[PDB]
């Protein structure tokens, strides 16, 4: 995955219906506030979401939600843990918890269309 | 904005409560499908969202939704147009339309907490 | 629609990809705070959403988002105005504005899976 | 809660950061398809969401997401089980699972603004 690699993300866990992607907030991931850009944290969660969902077969995202709980400073290590919430014949939904220092710093919810 | 620059995004319009950010889907923005990664398109929309929201004063994102309508291939030019939907004293909501070739390819909805 | 009827909702306008549903905040629509229950406002928006999407053929709702901006008191007349944002072969997305006395009370965003 | 009462909903469990609300899909809860109206299921989840969040002090809902997985028929007994995902100084987020006959019917995600 080009974008994943470009962001320095690594797959730490992969299994049917699940995946964990980890990354560090680098200097090129900060925003106007000096903290982790919302797009970086989303990209992280979305990547885990893409991996987990596609273990069930080709799937494309339809709708995703991202809830942010605490701004992260440069150097933070973040992990996105994707778990399967629902698996239908044409769609599937996953929950992705974004964790840093053992606490949930963001919550991602996404649904895909199964090809 | 470091992440914005790292993704090759440019601000094309800025005004009270609004902003337009544009970018091109580069080789480092593709995903496992060979099309624009969901995180790239979100980062684009989120950047316009951040700019528009912060014209009203310091604001941080609370919850955002991204709805994807068509996968984009390498080289696509994309524009994220942010408009203010609601402005309250402690929160504000924006709609961000992602357009390519004159058509809406994604819809972003986000709410911020005003600092 | 039984639930619509039960809540006293009326279809004011219905055309390709759009619909307007109206209702009044009744005594049986209030929450403890004494204002319009979030579920009532959602039911109103969801009803317009359903009618607008049906104009394109049978479909089932997948994911919906409701953003609340202002509280409504008992007796308020309110409307849900749905418009089509995207129509694809397999899904469709609509925006629904909940309005009362000329003010935007809430914003509903929803996607359906076309059957 | 008037609206809760009107829909026949019952509070089964209420503890710090969590709540369980139960109800039955009645004749006045159906849509045209003859299945549980999306607004009824949302009202159920929203009610548990409200009760769970109130355990932390007064708060108003900002943004909520509802993901529908399975249709429910008339007479079905259903429950909304809310759990706290995040508690911050100014906001809080909850996950609410809508269950019937041991199956996950829908997933509700909501954030409140703490007063
Ligand atoms: Cl959402
Ligand atoms: Mg009644």
């Amino acid at each position: 995955d080009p974008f994943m690699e470009a962001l320095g993300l690594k797959v730490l866990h992969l299994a049917p219906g699940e995946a964990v992607v980890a990354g560090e907030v680098r200097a090129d991931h900060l925003d106007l506030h000096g903290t982790a850009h919302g797009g970086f944290l989303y990209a992280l969660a979305d990547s885990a979401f893409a991996l987990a969902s596609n273990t069930r077969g080709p799937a494309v995202a339809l709708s995703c939600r991202m809830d942010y709980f605490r701004p992260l400073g440069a150097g933070a290590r973040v992990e996105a843990r994707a778990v399967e919430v629902n698996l239908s014949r044409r769609t599937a939904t996953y929950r992705v918890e974004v964790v840093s220092e053992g606490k949930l710093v963001a919550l991602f919810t996404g649904t895909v269309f199964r090809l």
Side-chain angles (χ1 to χ4, degrees), chain A:
Chain A
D1 193 291
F3 196 50
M4 282 190 68
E5 303 201 315
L7 271 47
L9 310 182
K10 286 293 187 177
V11 178
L12 304 185
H13 170 63
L14 181 63
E18 50 187 63
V20 177
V21 172
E24 185 167 311
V25 178
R26 300 182 316 195
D28 59 320
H29 298 156
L30 304 179
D31 66 9
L32 67 82
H33 295 293
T35 48
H37 193 288
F40 174 69
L41 293 180
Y42 179 101
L44 171 76
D46 184 66
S47 292
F49 163 67
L51 285 175
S53 60
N54 274 269
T55 64
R56 303 303 198 184
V60 294
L62 292 181
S63 181
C64 305
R65 173 179 172 114
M66 180 77 160
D67 290 307
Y68 299 95
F69 306 137
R70 172 174 81 74
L72 302 183
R77 172 188 159 68
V78 290
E79 215 171 79
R81 310 169 179 174
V83 294
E84 201 171 73
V85 175
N86 177 71
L87 180 59
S88 294
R89 179 158 80 65
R90 290 289 71 188
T91 53
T93 300
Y94 301 73
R95 157 169 56 259
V96 183
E97 291 177 10
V98 182
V99 182
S100 189
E101 284 193 46
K103 297 176 181 298
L104 189 68
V105 297
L107 177 66
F108 173 111
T109 307
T111 295
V112 299
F113 178 107
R114 306 183 67 196
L115 304 172

